[PDB]
Structures are given as structure tokens and as C-alpha cells.
Amino acid sequence: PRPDYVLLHISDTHLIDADDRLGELLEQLNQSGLRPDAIVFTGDLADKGEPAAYRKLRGLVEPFAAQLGAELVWVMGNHDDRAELRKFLLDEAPSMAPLDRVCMIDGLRIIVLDTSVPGHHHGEIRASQLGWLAEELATPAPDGTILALHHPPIPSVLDMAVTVELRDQAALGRVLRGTDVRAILAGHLHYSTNATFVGIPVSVASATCGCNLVHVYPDTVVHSVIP
């Protein structure tokens, strides 16, 4: 069966040997002959949100994505810095506003949401963002929506995770319920995990410092873990 879309889901690169780890992955993905429609990086791109790390990340990943004709989708994590990411990864004016955006890949909507809280490790979504999200989802996409964020809306199975988990998941749940969100892509946990959130499948990719393949069929979304 041919999927409608193929995505690559990578997370938690933590660049500041993370350079070798990511380099080795990209080289391995290049040799596979995989041709993704988009490559989605679900946060913690730079370990300390360093300008130099973003420059290195961009230098490694942009030629890889260009070779494949794949859209690059960057997401904020708790380790990242909004202003330095905008500047050195995106070529956008520095700002501390949430990195929220919408990207249509043919008929497939990818929504990037920013769960990060500046100077903190836990996750939160502000009122402005929920409203923005609700308004966007009021119009259905032809092939539905993939929501990409950092902190997963799933129960913490480790005590260590609870202190840095996504807070106020109920409010997000109220926005997402009944929408065309078909899957939520996340990171943060540094091990491969899946669950549902208000009936929506959530898939967490492990850290790079493997990744996931995402096959979007007409009726289901398949997430495969690539070590």
C-alpha cells in the first residue's frame, strides 16, 4: 500500500557527541532511499539554546532536506531559546513569542505548537495559543492535521518526568476534541512512547543524542521506530 504522506519524526538532538549522533542518523536515512514529504524535529534542538548550535544544526539538516525536496518543520523544546532559534535557524527577527505556525503539505495540515516556557523545563500552553489553535482547527484540512509539539499530553510513567511534564492538559484537550487532528507528534521523554489523548494518537520519538517514520494512510497513521 502507498501512503498519502511520509514524514520523518526526529527529536531531542541537544546540539551544543550529538553532532556525530545526528550526522550518523542523516547519513543512514540518506542511504535508505526514503523520500519524506516533511522532516519534523519535535524540540530540544539545542541543549543550551546556543546560536552556534543552531548554526550547526541548520548546516547539517538543510542540505539533507533540500536533497530530498522535503519540508523542514522545526519545533521549540524546553532546552531551546525562542529568540536565538528564530535568528539562527529560521532567519526571522528575534522574538520571545511562542513558536506557533501552520504548514500545509498538499492537503495535510501540520500545526507546530510551542509548549516551552522560557527559562523553565516544564510545559505550558498559554490562553493566546489555545485561541489561535481553536480558530485554526475550525476549518478542516483535506487530509486532516498532524499536531507537532514538544511536551506530550500523556501521563508521566516516571517520577522524574512529572516535574517537567506538560501542565493543564485539560484545556488543550477541550480544544482538540472533535477536530481533524489525526496524530500528535512529541518528544521530551527521550524514549519511544505512544498513547492517546482525548482519543487522538500521540507518538513520542526517542532522542538522537534513533527516530520515527510516519506513514499517513487515508484511514490511519502508522508510526515506526527506527533505531
Question: Can you say which residues are annotated as belonging to the binding site?
Answer: 12, 14, 44, 78-79, 150, 188, 190
List, as residue ranges, the binding site for Mn(2+). Answer: 44, 78, 150, 188
Is the four-CA dihedral 201, 35, 210, 61 of positive or negative sign? negative
111 and 96 in contact (C-beta within 8 Å)?
Answer: no
Phi/psi-derived region of residue 137, left when phi > 0, alpha when psi is between -120 and 50, beta in every other case: alpha
Among 87, 101, 190, 215, binds a second copy (CB under 8 A): 215
Among 44, 81, 143, 165, binds Fe ion (CB under 5 A): 44
Among 68, 72, 101, 201, binds a second copy (CB under 8 A): 201
Task: Rule CB under 8 A: say whether 193 interacts with a second copy.
Answer: yes
CB of 47 or CB of 180, closer to Fe ion: 47
Residue 43 Cβ, how far from Mn ion at the closest point, in Å?
6
Distance CA 172, CA 153 (A): 9
Residue 107 Cβ, how far from a second copy at the closest point, in Å?
19
Task: Rule CB under 5 A: say whether 78 interacts with Mn ion.
Answer: yes
Task: Rule CB under 5 A: say whether 12 interacts with Fe ion.
Answer: yes
Distance CA 86, CA 176 (A): 27
216 and 3 in contact (C-beta within 8 Å)?
Answer: yes
φ/ψ (deg, to 5) at 84? -70, -35
Task: Rule CB under 5 A: say whether 77 interacts with Mn ion.
Answer: yes
Among 44, 81, 143, 165, binds Mn ion (CB under 5 A): 44
CB of 85 or CB of 189, closer to a second copy: 189
Task: Rule CB under 5 A: say whether 208 interacts with Mn ion.
Answer: no
For 9, residues 6+ apart whose C-beta sits below 8 A from its C-beta are 40, 42, 185, 203, 205, 211, 212, 213, 214, 223
Residue 206 Cβ, how far from Fe ion at the closest point, in Å?
10
78 binds, among Mn ion, Fe ion, a second copy, none (CB under 5 to 8 A by kind): Mn ion
215 binds, among Mn ion, Fe ion, a second copy, none (CB under 5 to 8 A by kind): a second copy
Place of cell 490562553: 127
For 158, residues 6+ apart whose C-beta sits below 8 A from its C-beta are none
Residues that bind Fe ion (CB under 5 A): 12, 44
